[PDB]
Design a protein around this nucleic acid. Structure first.
Lengths: 188, 161, 261, 143
RNA sequence: UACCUGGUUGAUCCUGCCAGUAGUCAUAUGCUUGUCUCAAAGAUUAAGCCAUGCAUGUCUAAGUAUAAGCAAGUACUGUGAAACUGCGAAUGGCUCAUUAAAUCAGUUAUCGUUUAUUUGAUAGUACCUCUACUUGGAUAACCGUGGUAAUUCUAGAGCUAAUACAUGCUAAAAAUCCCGACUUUUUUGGAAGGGAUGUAUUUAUUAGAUAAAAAACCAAUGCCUUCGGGCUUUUUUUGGUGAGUCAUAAUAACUUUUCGAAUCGCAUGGCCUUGCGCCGGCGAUGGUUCAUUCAAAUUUCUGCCCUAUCAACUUUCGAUGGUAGGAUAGAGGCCUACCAUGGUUUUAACGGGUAACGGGGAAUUAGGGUUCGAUUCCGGAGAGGGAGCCUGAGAAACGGCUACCACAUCCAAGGAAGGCAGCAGGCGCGCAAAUUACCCAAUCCCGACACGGGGAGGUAGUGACAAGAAAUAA
RNA sequence: CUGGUGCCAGCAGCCGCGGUAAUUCCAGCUCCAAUAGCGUAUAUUAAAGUUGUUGCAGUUAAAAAGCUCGUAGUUGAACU
RNA sequence: AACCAGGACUUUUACCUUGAAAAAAUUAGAGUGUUCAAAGCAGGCAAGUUUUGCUC
RNA sequence: GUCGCUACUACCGAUUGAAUGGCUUAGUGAGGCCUCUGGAUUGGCAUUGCCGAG
């Protein structure tokens, strides 16, 4: 199989190292797991030491977080917007680490409505008292309002699906959101 | 070359046959070998044809239809013997065992009838060790709580002084 | 290569085992356990080569299956169990309660003790951390872990675990005037009293120890072992007390031995 | 060499596992001490760069050997070449000979490094093929 | 163990080499031979080719008995062929082909990694808002019976078992967070009753103060005094490392939901509603996590023969570095996309040769040095040359498999099948090197384990030589 | 020393002996050295101060570039 | 201000001394009746009791 | 010093030089592996769509 030694690599001084060993099993590699968008496709590979790695080729209903309130929920991944290095990876629609994706915000709207009560972009005494006690921090970014109006949100995955079998991330916000939006404004 | 249910090729072919499919016996674990086998369809190259009876005809063949074999072995498990003898819930299951004769065994006098063993019958030996295991669990919990209380006293003294 | 080794040849065996070079080709090859194979004595070596309670490898196995070697109060059956430093061997069919301690020259020797003082096993701690459920746990040099230890104990300290009844009953700190034995090195097996601790950046604390005769020497923190304080060694010392009896004085001792018969 | 805008790459250069919320304004910056008697430079405490492979405000750790040598080449990006010189022993002739070996160490934007300007480097885990050292202390000729 | 001599000339003194001289498990051969102790014996070319036998097997009362035997209590009750199951087979042993900062030697790091077994800790929590607590099916052997000339030749046909495989309540009680029937300030208004709340994965965030010591404001709100509003020794989590985002605790979600026992053998102890009901011991085998150990994998510095009639080498198709990703158990241009042109070198880079495995070490010995080191110890490589892969913690394993290349073999001409640089023995190359022997008794290894096995290993047969003692006299 | 050949056979590590008196050729006698061992062929080491840092030699025996500049390299006055 | 005690203390090396950790065998070499020796790591007491020990 | 005869040593050389082994160019490509498919057969559900697998 594919090897990861430096014996085949040319030395730092320019000399080419001759063959010394046959390919060993403590240095083996494996094929990439380009997990495109589709119905959940996860299998198992027995890695060295008896452990198991969960691969991924298609993933649905991933996990994404919201750090302002510290709430994470399962959401359905729609599509991939940007990915650094080769941009052709976006065209072939593969999910990897550090690649922004588009997500739905219907569960976020439902949780926000059932928590704060006061609807964004317009009896029950205990509910009203809770709303009054938790009113004041309901303000959100203008970008966070436009995404709710448009029904789609930008999220960044912070997990490797080819290693752990999950595509987990967080909602993009702040200066990173501004940088990414200004990066993709001339492209879209 | 033996049979192979699945291969549609109308002649013998070779494949990296695995122990999961029939016509193999592993010499050691993780062993796969290349062997030749025939297809799943029938041609003119066959010499012995294996067939099964579905429904008997009007006439009876004297050699096979008349002759029948008896079932010389019976149930072993508690569920198997219960379904074999259709006994009630409390019917002394130990009294429904099959007894054989040992006249050819050259026993001479008083032929010692031999019967198989019955499995999965409730015996108080297993319950004793199960209770002991639960005993060990409760002893572990009580010891954990006792040493936790001792360390709680130690931590209370330390935070006090 | 391709996996672990199960055969240890002789001559390559540790020198302090004092195994005969002839009469065989291979060494006992201590099995994995609580002590490193380079710093442990196999049970067969201790019972046969060091104690002569059985000859050749066969009779020693017979008594081990006979369930008589209650090491640390429990009977084991491994003929090559890695019995490390400060181990107790209690043969209750005979009454002996042997102790495993370094001698003056740095080799294991017979340290038979009474029934008392053979229950608690003095052990150095390795590190202190926090375990599951927010609780502290301690790990010793003999591969033994203690749950809920004394909060006043730090690394490179001493405990006296009771064994069988278990649990730490007493602990000893690491500071000046404490009696310290050297576990390994070129100053093997000699107790003194730590007087100076020299700090070196990164690692390699240097411990200066003064013996009974006030001759002075130095060792490493990873190789020291605190047993007692200002002449209050809670454990018994073997013959010679581990001072540093040199060759020039051992010659006089041998001459005096000759001038006795 | 020349410090540019930190967000001048395809990916947003960011300090991992640091977040800004409404309660805590702006983005806090985290720093650590490498140890072994060294001190964290002030501009590393208050700078702009990220430098994931830096002993400060980064992830690499300092452990192992500590060497000293003169940097010869700075033309490459964020790393340099250290030239260590020593005298070899010939038992036969009872004399010395000059022997040199070129190192390969990583330089943070925290240190302004040019030719000459002997520095001190320390082991910082393999970084790129032949880079296993990082510059920690610089005894500059200007100061 | 600081040593010489003969040879140029008619004769002399030098330079100079030749020769004599002495040593070497350093090799062979020639002549000769009555004994013991001790140690080695196909490396030098053919890491060339092999008929034949062996070298890896393993069971306690305690994983399965219906022996389809046996010697002698109506589920069996003693032996047990036969097999499945678990483990080892990655340890030993052989050889030195390849290998020139490669191996190896000394010295560091893994705060950049994995690990079967051993040791020590770890588990009143699984399901219902009607759940088995004891439960599914297949799977050997036996049994008739078939094809191939022989196969480690199997399927066809009846089944029966698992500490194999696949499911499945167990244990309370207390407490916590959410959904909310309800009133009447009886705080900031919380709880009747319903659910998750053990353990394990990933994601984000908070606390992670602690070298010590005073105040001005805002929010939810823990003790509420004596409702002015106070607000503390502490509930603010805590500890450790030279050094961290380290260990641990709290918050919000996910898991084709990991573990949390459907197993065996002996002591028949004690009870009263007397059911033949309750309860009580000594062991063994598995299983989650952590530490440790046995190992492995990278990795810092320094040290390698000859060659300039090799002076420039490396970047195409990775050569030097940055970002991001993939892969790996793990760092890393190991790989991929983009961005820069970099790195070494007269202190000899690079290329080539080596009749070069490296070292501990051996021979000679004033000292300095020179030569050798396949070989009883350590590390590396190989099992005809490559390449790929399953199993297994650990192999790119060859007494594991697969395909090509060069060989050998039975063929009925349809096919089948291998690897002694293992122990013996055969052919050939050869100046050059041994038995187709006995044994697990000693050293140790493997396994379910006092009981089995081990061409590892011990012993012996053969010699002219490797060292030590001495017949042929008196 | 005694017999056979007579630049022939041959001996012989080098010098070297043999053309009718051969202490060096082949036969006998005896003697010398080691000893159950001795010789021969090859590799290597000491001698080799003929590899020389210790520790060579360069006018005539082998050996100072025809001469000069010049960078690596080597060596570098005294004084704290 | 200033003083004493402990720790750090070479701007930066080369050099010299000592210590640490460091495989054994092998080399030198200490002890020791394989009849000496190549060896090996044991071994010894103790003639008048035989002692179910001591000593290295 | 040229010419000699011989045993033997070395060099160049037409033959667009031959015969092995590494280093590379171009073409093709066995083999195992990862992945996309395919559901004889096992099928619980006169019935008939759904859990499924080698």
């Amino acid at each position: 199989g594919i090897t990861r030694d430096s014996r085949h690599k040319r030395s730092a001084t320019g000399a080419k190292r001759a063959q010394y060993r046959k390919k060993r099993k403590f240095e083996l590699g494996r094929q990439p797991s380009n997990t495109r968008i589709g119905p959940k496709r996860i299998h198992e590979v027995r890695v060295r030491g008896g452990n198991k790695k969960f691969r991924a080729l298609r993933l649905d209903s991933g996990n994404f977080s919201w750090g302002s309130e510290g709430v994470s929920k399962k959401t359905r991944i729609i599509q991939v917007a940007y990915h650094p290095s080769n941009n052709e990876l976006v065209r072939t629609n593969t999910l990897t680490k550090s690649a922004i994706v588009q997500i739905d915000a219907a569960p976020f709207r439902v949780w926000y409505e059932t928590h704060y009560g006061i609807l964004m972009g317009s009896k029950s005494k205990h509910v009203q008292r809770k709303h009054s006690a938790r009113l004041g921090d309901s303000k959100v970014d203008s970008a966070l309002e436009t995404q709710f109006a448009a029904g789609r949100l930008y999220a960044v995955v912070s997990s490797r699906p080819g290693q752990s079998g999950r595509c987990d991330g967080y909602i993009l916000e702040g200066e990173e959101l501004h940088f990414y939006l200004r990066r993709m404004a001339p492209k879209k | 070359f033996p049979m192979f249910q699945g291969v549609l090729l109308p002649h013998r072919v070779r494949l990296l046959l695995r122990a999961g499919h029939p016509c193999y016996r592993p010499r050691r674990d993780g062993e796969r070998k290349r062997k030749s086998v025939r297809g799943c369809i029938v041609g003119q190259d066959l010499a012995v044809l294996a067939l099964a009876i579905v429904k008997q005809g009007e006439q009876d063949i004297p050699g096979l239809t008349d002759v029948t074999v008896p079932k010389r072995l019976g149930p072993k498990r508690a569920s198997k013997i219960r379904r074999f003898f259709n006994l009630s819930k409390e019917d002394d299951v130990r009294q429904f065992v099959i007894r054989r004769e040992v006249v050819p065994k050259k026993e001479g006098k008083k032929p010692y009838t031999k019967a198989p063993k019955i499995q999965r019958l409730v015996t108080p030996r297993t319950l004793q060790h199960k209770r002991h295991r639960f005993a060990l669990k409760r002893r572990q919990a009580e010891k954990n709580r006792e040493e936790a209380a001792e360390f709680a006293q130690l931590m209370a003294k330390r935070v006090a002084e | 290569v391709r996996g672990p080794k199960k055969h240890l040849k002789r001559v390559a065996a540790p020198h302090h085992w004092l195994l005969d070079k002839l009469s065989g080709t291979y060494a006992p090859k201590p099995s994995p356990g609580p002590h490193k194979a380079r710093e442990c004595l196999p049970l067969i070596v201790f019972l046969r080569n060091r104690l002569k309670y059985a000859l050749n490898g066969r009779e020693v196995k017979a008594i081990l299956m006979q369930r008589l070697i209650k090491v640390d109060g429990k009977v084991r059956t491994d003929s090559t169990f890695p019995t490390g430093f400060m181990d107790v061997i209690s043969v209750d069919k005979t009454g002996e309660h042997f102790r495993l301690v370094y001698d003056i020259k740095g080799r294991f020797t017979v340290h038979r003790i009474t029934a008392e003082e053979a229950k608690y096993k003095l052990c150095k701690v390795k590190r202190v951390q926090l375990g599951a459920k927010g609780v502290p746990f301690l790990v010793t040099h003999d591969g033994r872990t203690i749950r809920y230890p004394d909060p006043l104990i730090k690394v490179n300290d001493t405990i006296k675990l009771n064994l069988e009844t278990n649990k730490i009953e007493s602990f000893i700190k690491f500071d000046t005037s404490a009696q310290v034995m050297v576990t390994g090195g070129r100053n093997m097996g000699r107790v003194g009293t730590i007087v100076h601790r020299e700090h070196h950046l990164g690692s390699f604390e240097i411990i200066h120890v003064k013996d009974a005769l006030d001759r002075e020497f130095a060792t490493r923190l990873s190789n020291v072992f605190v047993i007692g304080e200002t002449g209050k060694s809670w454990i018994s010392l073997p013959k010679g007390k581990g001072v540093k009896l040199s060759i020039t004085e051992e010659r006089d001792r041998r001459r005096a031995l000759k001038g006795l018969a | 060499a020349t410090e540019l805008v930190v967000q001048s790459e395809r990916a947003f250069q960011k300090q991992p596992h640091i977040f800004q919320n409404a309660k805590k304004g702006a983005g806090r910056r985290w720093y650590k001490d490498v140890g072994l008697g060294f001190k964290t430079p002030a501009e590393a405490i208050y700078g702009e760069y990220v430098d994931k492979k830096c002993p400060f405000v980064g992830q690499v750790s300092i452990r192992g050997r500590i060497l000293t040598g003169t940097v010869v080449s700075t033309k490459m990006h964020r790393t340099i070449i250290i030239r260590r010189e020593y005298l070899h022993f010939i038992p036969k002739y009872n004399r010395y000979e000059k022997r040199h070996k070129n190192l390969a160490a990583h330089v943070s934007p925290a240190f302004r490094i040019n030719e000459g300007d002997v520095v001190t480097v320390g082991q910082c885990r393999p970084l790129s093929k032949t880079v296993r050292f990082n510059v920690l202390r610089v005894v500059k000729h200007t100061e």
